[model samples]
Target: DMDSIGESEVRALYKAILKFGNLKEILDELIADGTLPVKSFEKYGETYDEMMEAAKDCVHEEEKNRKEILEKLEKHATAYRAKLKSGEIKAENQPKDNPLTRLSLKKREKKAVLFNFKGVKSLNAESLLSRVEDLKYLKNLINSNYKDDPLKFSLGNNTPKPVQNWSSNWTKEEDEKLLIGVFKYGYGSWTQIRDDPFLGITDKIFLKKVPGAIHLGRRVDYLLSFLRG
Candidate 1:
């Protein structure tokens, strides 16, 4: 009860007003969580809309304290990436898929080093090749023309690999299927959407793509923009 009289009290009220649009539920959660100490309210309105009207002053106050509130929240996170990933905050102007911009590529360098010395230090090609997956396509077993050429591995030997026959182009019908897949599975679950029995994206189109999750998410991002356009 005594703790209900501090800076957090105001933030909890304003946050509730903005996020939940109902003061009671916010306070209920706050008190239940023992997170932000704020006074309980038994009754506050004739209608939920009226309650919102009562807290409307918070709109002005929240705007005033927006920067300070963000600082405090970011302090809790100690990371912009976590805040962005949590979907609670965003850092605008982050560029797409470049070593200069993509944070994940830092993890990429270590993987490169991990594989760098694997075959280089091996005593026998047969022993290393047995455990390594590079042989599957590194040398094409089919077709004499492109047998040694990595470039012709897919062209002369026609088969459904994820990247085979890949193109940046998408037909309107293809776009529709991708959209339908996302709608069916919901966002962020890429494999389920990719391998959907009927409309398997990689099966029909991408054999020409079940694209990887990162790549699929990128296309969906672009597709959404195109759809909106």
Candidate 2:
């Protein structure tokens, strides 16, 4: 039969040891210090400082390899944009709003073309303006000033809007109730408080959400403020 190890027994064995074992700690140290070249130390002149310098050189070499990977990604993006400009990558006749099918790749070019006209032609300014206005009008007719009108068809109910919740010191509801109880009946008697429904709640438990409970402590400040005012 296999034996079971208790959690407490495991904690007691290696309570505060960070790495907890030798093999794991060695790999961790090697990563932090970087790879060591024993051949370089033996063949060429090397000191303690020189060994540390080799570790730093390895880190810079590793960073350069990562940058080369990013350059390859940029080349692919440029090629994709070139295909998009030409009618070679046309949208499907039926399907619309597909990220892959529609190639709306915006290019940053300032030089005027001599009109080779090999690829797709540029959009006319007047035609583009008309299309933009038609789209805006279509959107407005479907939902005109929907944001400003909150009550219409409960349109704004399920928006998942962000809000803030907070508690404050000495609310009007608590102050008013406490004032009515004190004025109507005497404050000194405990049996009067116990029998009365007005004094059913302890001020501490009721006003827990009230701020600055620790510093001044309790509803003493609340009662005094009401009395003084």
TM-score computed on alpha carbons, candidate 2: 0.20
C-alpha RMSD (angstroms) for model 2: 28.8
In model 2, the runs with Cα more than 4 Å from the true position are 1-51, 90-229
CA lDDT, every prediction? 0.41, 0.32
Residue 100 alpha-carbon offset, candidate 2, angstroms? 11
The candidate scoring highest on lDDT is 1
Model 2 Cα lDDT, one tens digit per residue, 1-229: 1222233222221211111111122333323443222223222222222322433454455457545755665666566556667746653452454333333321222232111111313312222222233323323422554435312212122222221232533344434333333323322222333245654324422224532323222232234333333
Q: Give the 10-residue window scoring lowest on summed lDDT in candidate 1.
A: 111-120
Compared with the true structure, the alpha-carbon lDDT of candidate 2 equals: 0.32
Over 25-127, each residue of candidate 1 has an lDDT whose tens digit, in order, gives 4456556776445453542222224323333443445445655655565554456557677875545655475323333443233211111121222122222
Per-candidate count of clashing residue pairs (backbone under 3 Å): 3, 0
Count: clashes, candidate 2: 0
> Against the true structure, whose TM-score is highest?
1
